[PDB]
Amino acid sequence: ELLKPRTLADLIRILHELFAGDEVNVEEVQAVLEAYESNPAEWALYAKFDQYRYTRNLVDQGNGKFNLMILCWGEGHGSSIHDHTDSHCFLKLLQGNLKETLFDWPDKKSNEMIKKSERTLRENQCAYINDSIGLHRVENVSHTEPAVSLHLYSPPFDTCHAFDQRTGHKNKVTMTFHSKFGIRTP
Numbered sequence: 001e002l003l004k005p006r007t008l009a010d011l012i013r014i015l016h017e018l019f020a021g022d023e024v025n026v027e028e029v030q031a032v033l034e035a036y037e038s039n040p041a042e043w044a045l046y047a048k049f050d051q052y053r054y055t056r057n058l059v060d061q062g063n064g065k066f067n068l069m070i071l072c073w074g075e076g077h078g079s080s081i082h083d084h085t086d087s088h089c090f091l092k093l094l095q096g097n098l099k100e101t102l103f104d105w106p107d108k109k110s111n112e113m114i115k116k117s118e119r120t121l122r123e124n125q126c127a128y129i130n131d132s133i134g135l136h137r138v139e140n141v142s143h144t145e146p147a148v149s150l151h152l153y154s155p156p157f158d159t160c161h162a163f164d165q166r167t168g169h170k171n172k173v174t175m176t177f178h179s180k181f182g183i184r185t186p
């Protein structure tokens, strides 16, 4: 029975119940993520920025079923065009705004990747993506406001592909955590 998360800690407890089985009810996970009202005091520990690019900060390992992490986006910071390695990916805004641009999977032929759509994700909104939906790029286009987002990936993954927008060619990238459980991990 899906109740409103009172705090980040309560949210994490609810997610462990939702991921207790072998499958994922996407709409229920999205609904509970959206229902958590961002409270900056609860996640300040994980919000560790870098001057030059966005940072990934591990919050919870989900008893092995999912990774929950906080991403911190300085002004102008963005991602590659990327896939999600056959995982579910949920993205909830905790602070600021992010622009999400969707792309189709490239064809074998080298060609410019054209965007299919774009939207602005605003505070407390939760977006969802998986490989069957397509690829995306996520960017903080603000010149004045850092953004902070809460990401849930199931199953967890530590590698994905980055796509060259000019050709559609991909390269495997291994992502690293900036911090884990509030502790910087160089």
Ligand SMILES: [Fe+3]
Binding pocket: 082, 083, 084, 089, 136, 138
């Ligand atoms: Fe993504």
